[PDB]
Amino acid sequence: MKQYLELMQKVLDEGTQKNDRTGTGTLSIFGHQMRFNLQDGFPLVTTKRCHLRSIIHELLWFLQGDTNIAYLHENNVTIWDEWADENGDLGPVYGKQWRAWPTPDGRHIDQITTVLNQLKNDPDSRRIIVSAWNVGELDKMALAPCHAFFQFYVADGKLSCQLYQRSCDVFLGLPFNIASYALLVHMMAQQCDLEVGDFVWTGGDTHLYSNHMDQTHLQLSREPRPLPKLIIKRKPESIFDYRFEDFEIEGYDPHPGIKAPVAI
Amino acid sequence: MKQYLELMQKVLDEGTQKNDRTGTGTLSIFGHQMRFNLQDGFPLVTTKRCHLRSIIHELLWFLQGDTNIAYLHENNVTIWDEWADENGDLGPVYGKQWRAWPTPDGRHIDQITTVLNQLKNDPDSRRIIVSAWNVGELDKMALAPCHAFFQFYVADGKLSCQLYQRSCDVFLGLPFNIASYALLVHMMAQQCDLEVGDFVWTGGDTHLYSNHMDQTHLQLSREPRPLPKLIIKRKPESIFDYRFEDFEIEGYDPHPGIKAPVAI
Numbered sequence A, B: 001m002k003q004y005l006e007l008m009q010k011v012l013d014e015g016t017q018k019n020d021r022t023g024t025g026t027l028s029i030f031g032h033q034m035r036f037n038l039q040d041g042f043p044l045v046t047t048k049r050c051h052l053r054s055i056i057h058e059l060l061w062f063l064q065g066d067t068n069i070a071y072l073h074e075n076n077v078t079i080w081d082e083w084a085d086e087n088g089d090l091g092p093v094y095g096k097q098w099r100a101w102p103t104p105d106g107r108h109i110d111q112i113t114t115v116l117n118q119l120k121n122d123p124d125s126r127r128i129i130v131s132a133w134n135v136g137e138l139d140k141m142a143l144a145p146c147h148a149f150f151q152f153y154v155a156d157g158k159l160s161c162q163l164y165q166r167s168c169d170v171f172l173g174l175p176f177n178i179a180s181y182a183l184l185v186h187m188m189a190q191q192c193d194l195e196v197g198d199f200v201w202t203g204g205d206t207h208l209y210s211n212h213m214d215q216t217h218l219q220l221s222r223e224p225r226p227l228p229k230l231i232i233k234r235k236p237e238s239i240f241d242y243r244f245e246d247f248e249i250e251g252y253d254p255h256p257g258i259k260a261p262v263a264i
C-alpha cells in the first residue's frame, strides 16, 4: 500500500543505524504517523501476500483474554511459538490486560466491555482508551507490548481509532498490526451500529532489521494493487462471539509472499 | 510558533462540531503529529505570553510525586484549583503514577528512576516509557490524564521524546504541554549527558473550545517571533533536585497575553 511503501523508503533514506535488544541491528526512525480511511478499502498489504489466517486468529485470541498459545496451535497459527514457555505460556500479555487488567484492591477490569459501554452511552468521550501497558506486570510478560495503547473516537456517525505502537518491525510486524486493528475497528463499528472512519497509526521506534534489506528492496520494486473489501457475514450477539468463518476478504490479489527471519 | 498556528488553522478548517463532557462544544480533529527540533530553540509560544512560572512549577510538582495543590499555592500557581477537593487533593493523578505506580502485590514503581536507569545502561531500548494511564486508579482521579504516555529514544548522542496526548485543549493546554515536556527532555538529557533531539507531539482528540474562537482569530493574526533559548544554570545531583531558579529563558519577547475561560 502506498502509505506503507512510503514508510519503508523513509526508513531506508532517513533511518539511523541502531543496535538493538536482539543483536541484529536496525535502521530506525522515531515518530511517524499514517492514516487509513477505512471506507477506501481494507488496508491489507498487496505487495506481498499476508497470512490472513494468522492475523484473524491472533485478534480473536486477544479478545478471549487468552495468553496461552494452545488456541493458536489448535488453529495452526505458530507466530507466537518463539516466546512461549514449556507450558505454552506468555505471561499476562495483550489479551489479559485487555480483558482482565488487575488492580491493587483485587479487581479485574475488562477494558473491552468498558469501551463498548462508552461507545454506546457516551460516544463523544475523549477517554475511550484501551491500554496493554500495565507497568506492574511488565516484568512477567514474555515481551513488552509493541502495540501499546489505543483510542477510539466518534464523529459524524463514524468510528475512528488511533494506535500508539512503541516499537515497530516494519517488514514483518507492521502489515499484521495494521490489518489486525482495522479488523477490530470494523467489529466495534458493527457492534455499535457505526460506520467505519479512520485508522490512525502512530509509531515510536519504527525500524527495519538489517537482515530484511534484500526483502525490502524486492518489495519496493512492486506496484500496489487495489485494496480488498472486508465483508462481515453476520452480526454476532457480542464482540466476544466472532468466528473465523464470519469474515470474507474479497478481491485480495497480492504479489507473492516474501520470507524473512524473525529477530528473537 | 509555526507548527502551533498551523494546527490552530487546521482545526478551524477541518474540525467537526462535537459536543463534549463540559457542555461547552468544540471543533475537533482526531490524530495529529508535530515535531520540534529542540536544537532550534525552546518551543514556547510567542504569539501570546505564556506564564512560565506555572509551567515550571507544575513540572517540578509532578516530579515530586505530589498530587495535592499545596505546593502550587505556596508558589502562587492556581492552574489546578478548579478540580481539587476541600483538602486540596486531586487523587492519584500524574505525579503519583510517575513516581509511585501501585501494583496488585503491594509494590510502588518509580517510573522516573526506572527511565534514568534505562537511559544510563540501555539507551538503545525501545521500552523507555512512562505511563500515567493506570486503568485501576482512573476512577479515583479528578480528571483522566490528558498527556497520557510518553517514550524516550536515543540516537547519535541525542535524546528524543514522544508524547501521546489523548485530549488536547489547543488554546489553553497545548502551549503549556509542549513547554512542559520540552523542559523535561532538557533535564533528562542534562542528567544523562546527552544532547537534546526532537520532541514529537501526537494528539488524539485535538480541539478548540467554542468560546475560544475570538481568541483564536486574534492570535492567528500575529506573527511568530524567534524562539527563546533555555539555559539550565547548574547540574543538580538528581532529576528530583531541580529548582525554579535553575532555569533561565533568554530572549523571550512575546506578543501580549490573551485571556480565555477554562471549560470545567
Ligand SMILES: Nc1nc2c(c(=O)[nH]1)N[C@H](CNc1ccc(C(=O)N[C@@H](CCC(=O)O)C(=O)O)cc1)CN2
Pocket (backbone or CB within 6 Å): A050, A051, A054, A078, A079, A143, A169, A172, A173, A174, A176, A258, A259, A260, A262, A263, A264
Ligand atoms: N523482531 C520481531 N519482530 C516482530 C515480533 C517480534 O517479537 N520480534 N513480533 C510481531 C508479532 N507479529 C508477528 C507477525 C508476523 C510474524 C511472521 O513471522 N510472519 C510471517 C509468516 C506468517 C506465518 O506464520 O505464516 C510473514 O512472512 O508475514 C511474526 C510475528 C511482529 N514482528
Ligand SMILES: Nc1nc2c(c(=O)[nH]1)N[C@H](CNc1ccc(C(=O)N[C@@H](CCC(=O)O)C(=O)O)cc1)CN2
Pocket (backbone or CB within 6 Å): B050, B051, B054, B078, B079, B143, B169, B172, B173, B174, B176, B258, B259, B260, B262, B263, B264
Ligand atoms: N477544558 C480544559 N482545558 C484544559 C485543562 C482542563 O482541565 N480543562 N487542563 C489543562 C492543564 N493545563 C492548564 C494550562 C493552563 C491553564 C490556564 O488557565 N492558563 C492561563 C492562565 C495562566 C495563569 O494561571 O496565570 C493561560 O492564559 O494560559 C489551565 C490549565 C489545560 N487545558
Ligand SMILES: *[C@H]1[C@@H]([N+](=O)[O-])C(=O)NC(=O)N1[C@H]1C[C@H](O)[C@@H](COP(=O)(O)O)O1
Pocket (backbone or CB within 6 Å): A021, A022, A143, A144, A145, A146, A147, A167, A168, A169, A170, A173, A174, A177, B126, B127
Ligand atoms: C512487536 C510485536 N509483538 O511482540 O506483538 C508486534 O505486534 N509488532 C511489532 O512490530 N513488534 C516488533 C517491534 C520489535 O522489532 C520487536 C519487539 O522488540 P522490543 O521492541 O525490543 O521489545 O517486535
Ligand SMILES: *[C@H]1[C@@H]([N+](=O)[O-])C(=O)NC(=O)N1[C@H]1C[C@H](O)[C@@H](COP(=O)(O)O)O1
Pocket (backbone or CB within 6 Å): A126, A127, B021, B022, B143, B144, B145, B146, B147, B167, B168, B169, B170, B173, B174, B177
Ligand atoms: C487536559 C489537561 N490536564 O488535565 O492536565 C492537559 O494537561 N492538557 C489538556 O489539553 N487538557 C484538556 C483536554 C480537554 O479539553 C480537557 C480534559 O477533558 P476530558 O478530555 O473530557 O478529560 O483538558
